[PDB]
Each structure stands twice: as C-alpha cells, then as structure tokens.
Design a protein around this ligand. Structure first.
Ligand SMILES: CCCCC[C@@H]1O[C@@H]1CCCCCCCCCCC(=O)O
Lengths: 174, 174, 174
C-alpha cells in the first residue's frame, strides 16, 4: 500500500548552507570532505513551505567522466507539526538516485520504502518522490496536492516564499 | 504490537564526551559544527547499567529565540549482549523531540517506530521512551521494570554507578 | 521471510580510503576522530565485482584491553543496478559485530533485519552476512553462490579484479 509524497528542496542561500569541511588533498571534492547542509522544503505542488532538510553529505569520490560527485547522504525531511522522514543513500550530482527511507516520526511513524531524488538545478533545486509504505493513515490533503512537474524553472508560490499563513503548514520547520 | 522501552542516558564526563569540532562561521554553534558523542545508558527503572549511546550530532542552526540549538543526530543505544537500537532525527537543546527508529540488531532485529527524547538536565541527563514495533519477542523483564518518573533529580542506583553485579546487565556495553 | 546474502569488502588501495580525520588529542584513535571510507564489494563466492561500500566511521573510544577501536558506522553497500542496502551500528576492530539494516532501494526496497560484520584483515578484508527480511522477490542467483571460506587469504576471481565482463555484475558500482 504505497502513498506517493513529492516535495521540492530549495537552497535559498539564507541558511549558511552548504558548509564545506575540506580535507581531501584535491582541488576537486574527494574522500575526506564533509558537507553538513540544510535547505528549505516545499510541497510537491509548490503552494506551501513545510519545513527543511537537515543532515550530512559525506564525499565518496569525484567522478570526472560524469562531471560530478558521489556523496553518501544521511539526513531528515521536516514537515512542521506533522513529523519527519529520515533517509540514507546515494546523492549523485550527475544523475537521479534512490535513497532508503530509514524511518519517520509523527504521522510518518512506521514509514519505509525508497525515495527518488531528481536534481533539477545544481545545487539549488531538487525534487523528491517518496514511495511511502507503513503509514497509519492517509497523508493530509495539504501535502498531497498534484505536484508541479519538475523543471529547471519551478519556483515556490509567492505566499510560500513570503511565509503567509496560506503558504505554510502549521509550525513549519525553520 | 507497541512494546514501550524507557532508558536514561547520562553523561558522567568520563568518556571524553562531548568532543566538539567547531568549524562554523559563528561564535555560537552553527552549521559546520560536529559533535561526536557517547554517554552511559541505564534501565528505565535506573537499577541497572545497560550500555552506552554512540554517534554523531550535526549542528543545523542556532535558535536564538529559544536560547538553544538544533542538531540532526545519528546514533545507537547499546544494551550489552541484547543488541542495539539505531535512530535518526532532531535533537533540540531547548525542547522534547521524537526520533525515527531506523533499525536494530540482536533482540531488536526488526525494530521500527519512533522514540521520545526528553531532556532533563542540559546536557548530562536525558530520558527516552521507545515505542517499539516489529520485535520477535516480548522484551526481557530486566529491561522493562516500571520507569522512575523523569525529573531533574534522578540518579542511577548507586550499585549501577559502581558497576556491581546486581547493578549491571551481563556484559553491559562500555 | 529471511534471505541470507554474503559479500566480501576489500580495500584494494586505489580509492583514497580510508581517510583519517584526526581531532582527538591522542596519538591513538579517540572520540573526535572521523573516518570517511569506501571499499570494493564482491559477491560471497568472489566471482563478481558488485560495487562498493561508502560512508563514515565515527571513532567512539579506543579499547586498550583489546588492542583495538570501537567505531559507530553509517554506510551503504552498492550492488550496481540492483540497488543498495544501508546500515547503522558498531564496528569493533577486535571482534565480530552486528549492524542494523536501516533500509534499501531497488531490489532491496523495504529491506530490514541485521548484518554480521567479520573482519579478516585489519582493515583491508571483511566478510558480511545479511539476514534480509522485507524483499519483494528472491535474491538473483548471481548474488547467492556458495561463499568462499572466510580467511585472511581470500582474493577476488581474477576476472572480477580485472573488471572483465564475466567477472562483474551489470553496471557494477564504482
Ligand atoms: C565499517 C568498516 C568497514 C570497512 C573498514 C573501512 O576502512 C575503514 C575502517 C575505519 C578505520 C580503520 C583505519 C585504520 C588506519 C590506522 C592509521 C591511523 C592510526 O593508527 O591512528
């Protein structure tokens, strides 16, 4: 029994993120470089600010033939009063990936399955579709609005950007 | 289905912990700062030493209006030869939170659900209630004694602190 | 319900791994020390390269009485186009341990359970046995060949080491 939940992760450059901790003996990213990060999170339909992403990217290797990096990522997605989802897996700057859903809290207690990561604009816009199993209830309607198809040009609704009650969930994470 | 398990985490300052790696742009905690840690773990009734917590807090932001920090935490709870529980989620220095139970080993194989984290004395005393689903069996009686109600004043039993046989589980983690 | 899967992890010294981030005051490993890593992953029968391991070891304590270290490990095992498995738990340099399976993706979507970690040569050769629950299908035959007897002398098939078509899985992770 799968419930799809899609969200847009956007770096609006106002959270001091990403923070690069440089250790690799390379001008390029390399093993040793650690990247704590936190970006804003919006609903799949771009109408509401829900919260944030928060966690750690561990650089694994630069991939020169793909013109990108492989990170191993451990982080959570915060949904204001509703709770959160946690993930572990590959973040490849150069292609879509699937991460494991390691669990959740709140309405996400019991969550499991995988989530597809699509990078739209490096590094500032990402789109995700969680294929959620194990939820106690149907997801709230304000989170399951039909998603905006992902494109380079997507923007949150101005109400969501401006943090108006119509453009946020209750206690949205910040 | 839900088996509730409570434990006290106590920092007794004898494990080199916390170790603060301070990298942030700020004088206060900020993104970039990392805090590997390990504390002692006692049963919910405070009668027995069970083991340790072990993992990493990733600083996400300072929260000036709440006089405290938001961390993203990834860590495990060790119960001697019984096994361990793993978690991922928010640790807020100023209020309670819930973390995802990401999995378990030993008697905790198959573990899922969420855990409530209550801070009792910052930073040395914390109380957790795991709402455990998925376990193959009823939890052993030595781990499910009636919890001491959480307060600022709790202490582990003097026999547990002193690592006497009556105050430890067999091969308690250290 | 339970499907067993063994793999060999081998550091062939060509991936810049491990990377020791030294922060503890001591010449020996201690809390503060972080070790990003990535090794090669082969089938338990050693006939095929499947992919890699990738993640972070957090040093928890040195254990003088065992002449070794305790790490807390967060990492994934990559199986090419099959997907991946993610884990959280203890790596002890001086004895076998079990880690938690936190989830998977691809064929390993919905994966849970635990994995045994057995060190064969510190730290270049390890042998794993996953006890996998939650999988949609039986594991593919090319991953379930009888394991080579674990020892310090194990080596990948020469076709596997040389990346010949007959010694790799489809789109093996690198
Ligand atoms: C979960 C572990 C899986 C594979 C092991 C991987 O290589 C990583 C092990 C972490 C640390 C071992 C590195 C030891 C190097 C010692 C040199 C520095 C010193 O002796 O203090």
């Amino acid at each position: 029994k799968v419930q799809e939940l899609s969200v847009y992760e956007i770096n609006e450059l106002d959270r001091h993120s990403p923070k690069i901790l440089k250790n690799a003996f390379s001008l390029m990213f390399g093993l040793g470089d650690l990247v704590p990060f936190t970006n804003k999170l919006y609903t799949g339909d771009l109408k509401k600010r829900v919260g944030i992403t928060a966690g750690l990217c561990v650089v694994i290797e630069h991939v020169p033939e793909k013109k990108g990096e492989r990170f191993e990522a451990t982080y959570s997605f915060y949904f204001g009063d509703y709770g959160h989802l946690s993930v572990q897996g590959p973040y490849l700057t150069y292609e879509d990936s699937f991460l494991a859903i390691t669990g959740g809290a709140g309405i996400f207690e019991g969550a499991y399955g995988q989530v597809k990561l699509q990078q739209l604009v490096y590094p500032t816009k990402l789109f995700y579709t969680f294929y959620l199993k194990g939820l106690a209830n149907d997801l709230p309607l304000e989170l399951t609005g039909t998603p905006v198809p992902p494109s380079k040009d997507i923007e949150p609704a101005p109400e969501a950007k401006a943090l108006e009650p119509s453009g946020v969930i209750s206690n949205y994470t910040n």
